[PDB]
Design a protein around this ligand. Sequence first.
Ligand SMILES: Cc1cc2nc3c(=O)[nH]c(=O)nc-3n(C[C@H](O)[C@H](O)[C@H](O)COP(=O)(O)O)c2cc1C
Ligand SMILES: N#C/C(C(=O)Nc1ccc(-c2ccccc2)cc1)=C(/O)C1CC1
Ligand SMILES: O=C(O)c1cc(=O)[nH]c(=O)[nH]1
Length: 360
Amino acid sequence: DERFYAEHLMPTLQGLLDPESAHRLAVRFTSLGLLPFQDSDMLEVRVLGHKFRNPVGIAAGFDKHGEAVDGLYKMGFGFVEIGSVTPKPQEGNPRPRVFRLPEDQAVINRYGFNSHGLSVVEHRLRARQQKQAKLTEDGLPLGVNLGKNKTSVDAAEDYAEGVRVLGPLADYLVVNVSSPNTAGLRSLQGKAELRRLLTKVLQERDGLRRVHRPAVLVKIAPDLTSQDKEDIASVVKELGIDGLIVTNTTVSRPAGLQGALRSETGGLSGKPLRDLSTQTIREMYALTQGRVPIIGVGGVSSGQDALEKIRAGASLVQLYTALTFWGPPVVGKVKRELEALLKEQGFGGVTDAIGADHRR
Ligand SMILES: Cc1cc2nc3c(=O)[nH]c(=O)nc-3n(C[C@H](O)[C@H](O)[C@H](O)COP(=O)(O)O)c2cc1C
Ligand SMILES: N#C/C(C(=O)Nc1ccc(-c2ccccc2)cc1)=C(/O)C1CC1
Ligand SMILES: O=C(O)c1cc(=O)[nH]c(=O)[nH]1
């Protein structure tokens, strides 16, 4: 129940544990299915070669190693993304590396891709691969988000290894070139780098057998220049990339942040990123002429937040940070409010609202 979690459970949990410990305990509880809304057809969306029974997903970073997929579907998410996963295991940055900004409903993290590695996650997904095939057919798809190791010398070979190893187990894969916490990674977003990296990714993906061939998406940052966005849009059309994830966390620090920890290094998420993300979705949708599916992510904690990103051009949305403040009831809250607003605004379902701001 919303108020109980919002007002009692979550604050108490937050007073008791540092945020990294709270996150680990939350993954454990979720993966055991220790948690307590029926989805309307208005919320169903068809995109990326799949049906999604509702358009609200959990963003990458919550379940980094694939341990809690089924408990996430049970929380009400229409789709789950895990990762980012790197080819070899690696520890990530020294602690502390995650900071709560409760007066801003924000988080700053600099995990640095702590990952159990491809092999461990491959085994975990294979142990439930046929159960995921049926979830997917029932409208509950799985994405896998790929990163690169810290000491790797050849970024494109790290991503290609992830497509070869986890591509056969995913409905879509994400080439995450926008973490702000791995040195040099964001420079993969530049025109020449990106084109060469994505050509190699797509060749690897196309060499998979047909029933194991995922869609491929690129996840980008909220901090790009106008020139960067134009170059991304052009590469994405030139290569037939299947969609974009918009956006990762920001390295900016918007005026007015009150949290005592606002000057920690790392990516900032939650409310202060919300409109910078929505504006990036609006611009990428226009530059791609509405023809490249976008998954909208950054500061979503309500139905109105989801629908804004929807009308700016997103076909699906994701959240993470709002879960850390509101807990599990936020998921049904976002869905029930989104459905009430679609009705109030005269849309037949999510699908008719996608990109609607661009048609006024
Ligand atoms: C604690 C933390 C860890 C994250 N780790 C990843 C990650 O490994 N891969 C990734 O693509 N995005 C990662 N993200 C970014 C989220 O997927 C999402 O893009 C961002 O947090 C904005 O959404 P939100 O405001 O709803 O949290 C992480 C975010 C947070 C808060
Ligand atoms: N701080 C913090 C939290 C956090 O509190 N996460 C969280 C998410 C879901 C729950 C929850 C509560 C009840 C059942 C299942 C999950 C609890 C904590 C995070 O997930 C990220 C690293 C900062
Ligand atoms: O591992 C992390 O540091 C991480 C990766 C990512 O893509 N985004 C982020 O905010 N943190």
